[PDB]
Design an enzyme around this catalytic site. Structure first.
Site, PDB file in Angstrom:
ATOM      1  N   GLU A  64       5.671  42.182  28.639  1.00 15.55           N
ATOM      2  CA  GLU A  64       6.509  41.003  28.409  1.00 15.55           C
ATOM      3  C   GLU A  64       6.894  40.224  29.661  1.00 15.55           C
ATOM      4  OE1 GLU A  64       8.181  42.186  24.208  1.00 15.55           O
ATOM      5  OE2 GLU A  64       9.370  43.046  25.906  1.00 15.55           O
ATOM      6  N   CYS A 140      -2.633  30.209  13.276  1.00 13.88           N
ATOM      7  CA  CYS A 140      -3.701  29.454  13.900  1.00 13.88           C
ATOM      8  C   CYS A 140      -3.191  28.047  14.137  1.00 13.88           C
ATOM      9  CB  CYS A 140      -4.949  29.445  13.010  1.00 13.88           C
ATOM     10  SG  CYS A 140      -4.839  28.558  11.384  1.00 13.88           S
ATOM     11  N   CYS A 143      -2.852  25.864  10.748  1.00 15.06           N
ATOM     12  CA  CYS A 143      -1.647  26.293  10.007  1.00 15.06           C
ATOM     13  C   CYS A 143      -0.319  25.954  10.687  1.00 15.06           C
ATOM     14  CB  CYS A 143      -1.676  27.767   9.663  1.00 15.06           C
ATOM     15  SG  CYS A 143      -2.909  28.133   8.425  1.00 15.06           S
TER      16      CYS A 143
HETATM   17 ZN   LIG Z   1      -4.086  29.947   9.653  1.00 14.55          ZN
END
Ligand SMILES: [Zn+2]
Ligand SMILES: [Zn+2]
Ligand SMILES: [Zn+2]
Ligand SMILES: [Zn+2]
Lengths: 148, 153, 151, 150
Positions: A64, A140, A143
Site C-alpha cells: 500500500e 473496467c 463500466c
Molecule cells: Zn465492466
C-alpha cells in the site's frame, strides 16, 4: 545494484498476494527480507524502515505505498544503490482517477512494472483497471463511465 | 474503451522505434492514426484536437516528457472515447528525478513497456538511467546501468 | 551468460520491426551484431541451416538477431543455447501458430528457452480491433472470435 | 473468447502461488472456476477428464504442473478458449537437462500472455535463476551457475 519492481492496479486485483509471492521466493532462497505496510512492520514514515533493515537484508517489500509520503522515492533509490532489491505494491489511481503521487514516482523509478487486473464488479469480465466509490468496487473503463 | 500503452526508459533505448512498431500495426490494418511530437509537431496537448478525426483509431505521442501534465486528461478523454493511445517518453532525468508527465501517464497506462539501452560504460544490455558527462570524445548524455551511474556520476 | 528474448504473434503484428528496435539499440551502443533470416550489422544474412550462423559470428559479436524462426530446423534450439552459454544475447522473432492454429515447433522450443517473451498483436482484419492473435487462410490476421466466425 | 495466460520458470520460482493468486481474484469477483492437477480442484490422469467438471457456468480454468500432462492438453485448452473460458496454466518450461517440456512449449505457443518467473539462485544467491539442476535433489540456478556446476 538492486532492482525495483512495482506492482499496481485497482483494488481487488491481487496486488498484495503478488507482493507476498515474491516474499515467498526470497525466503525459499534463504535471502533475508524486510516487509512493511503503512508479518509486516507497520510504519508511519519511510524513514522508519532503516531500523528494520540489516547489513544482511537483500529484499525489502512494501505494501500500500500510495499511503506513504513521497520521500519513499529517495529511500528506495538508496536501497537500490546499496544492492537491495525492492518490491512495492500499491494503487495507481484514486477512485476519481487521479494518480497517487507516491506510486507515480515509484513507477518512474521502476526497473519492472506489473499492472494487475481485477474482475469487473458490473460486467464480470477479467478486464477491470479502475476503482469506483460506492465501499469500493473494481470496474473496467466502460463500466466506470456508465456508472458515473 | 481505448487502452493506453506507455513506453519508457533512458536515452538510446529504442523507444521511438518501438512506438513505430505500433504505428505500423495500425497502418497495416488500414486504420487512421494521428502521430504527435513536441507526425505533427505541436506545443500544447490541446492542439491534438485539430488533427484527430472521427475515424482516428490510434493516437501516438513521442517525447512525452516535454508536454505539460495536462496531457493526462487529454489522453484520459481519448481512452473514454474508444481511441487507443501509445506514448513514448523518458521516465527519469539525467539527475534521476521523475519527469512529471511520464509519471502521470504510467499511473493511467493499461500496459507499461520498460526499455533498456546498452550501458555506455560496461557494455551490457542493462542500462536503465541517463547521465550527463564531459563531451570531449564521440557535455553529452549517455545511457548507463545503475552501478555505472554510481561509479561515474 | 547471454539472454534470450522471443517476440511472437500472428502475421502483421509488427514482429520484424520490434526485432530491429533491438538491433538499433545494440548498434547505437557500438556493439557488434549478426542478423539472420531463413532461406524461404546492416545485412540480414539469409541462411538455410542454423549451423550456418557460426561463420558470421566473430569472437567480438555481442548480439545475434534471427527473424522468421518458424522456418528454421528445430536444431536452432541447441545453437541458440550454445550462443547463450558463450555470453551472446539472442533475439528471435517468428510466428507462434500456423494458419491452422497448430504450434510452430521451432518457435515453441525457443519460447521454453527464452528469458523474456514478447507477445505481439495485430489489427483484426474482420473486427478492426487491436486484438488479433491468430493468422487465417491471402493470409489475414484475426482475433479468436473472428477466426471462429470465418472458419 | 477466453484468453490464455501461461506461467513458467524453474522450480521454486513461485509458479503454483502465482496461479492460485489468479484463482483468488476470480473467486472474489464471483466467477465460477475449476482447478486441475496431473472452487474445486481435481487430480486427473488425462486432459480429456476436465470436460466432465466444466459447467456452462465456468468462466476460469486453472491448470498446474502442465509439463506432466499429455500434449493433447493443447487442443483441450483451445476448445475451452473457444467457448469463452479463460485459462491459466503453470508448469516448467525446461527439464533439468535444459530440454523443452513439450506440453508447456505448445501452450506457450497458444498463450495470449506469458509470465516467466525467476527463482533465487541456489549457488550465487541472486534473483536471477531461470534453470533447474539435479544435484539426489533439484535446485534453481542462473545459467552461469548451471554451467559452473554442470
Ligand atoms: Zn465492466
Ligand atoms: Zn554499466
Ligand atoms: Zn476480430
Ligand atoms: Zn547463480
Amino acid at each position: 545494484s538492486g532492482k525495483l519492481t512495482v506492482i499496481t492496479g485497482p483494488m481487488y486485483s491481487g496486488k498484495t498476494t503478488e507482493l507476498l509471492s515474491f516474499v515467498e521466493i526470497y525466503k525459499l532462497g534463504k535471502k533475508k527480507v524486510a516487509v512493511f505496510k503503512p508479518e509486516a512492520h507497520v510504519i508511519e514514515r519511510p524513514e522508519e524502515m532503516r531500523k528494520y533493515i540489516e547489513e544482511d537484508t537483500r529484499g525489502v517489500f512494501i505494501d500500500e505505498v500510495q499511503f506513504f509520503n513521497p520521500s519513499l522515492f529517495e529511500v528506495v533509490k538508496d536501497l537500490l544503490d546499496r544492492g537491495i532489491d525492492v518490491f512495492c505494491a500499491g494503487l495507481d489511481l484514486t477512485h476519481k482517477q487521479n494518480p497517487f503521487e507516491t506510486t507515480a514516482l515509484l513507477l518512474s523509478l521502476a526497473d519492472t512494472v506489473i499492472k494487475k487486473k481485477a474482475v469487473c464488479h458490473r460486467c464480470g469480465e477479467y478486464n477491470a483497471t479502475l476503482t469506483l466509490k460506492v465501499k469500493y468496487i473494481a470496474v473496467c473503463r466502460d463500466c466506470y463511465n456508465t456508472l458515473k
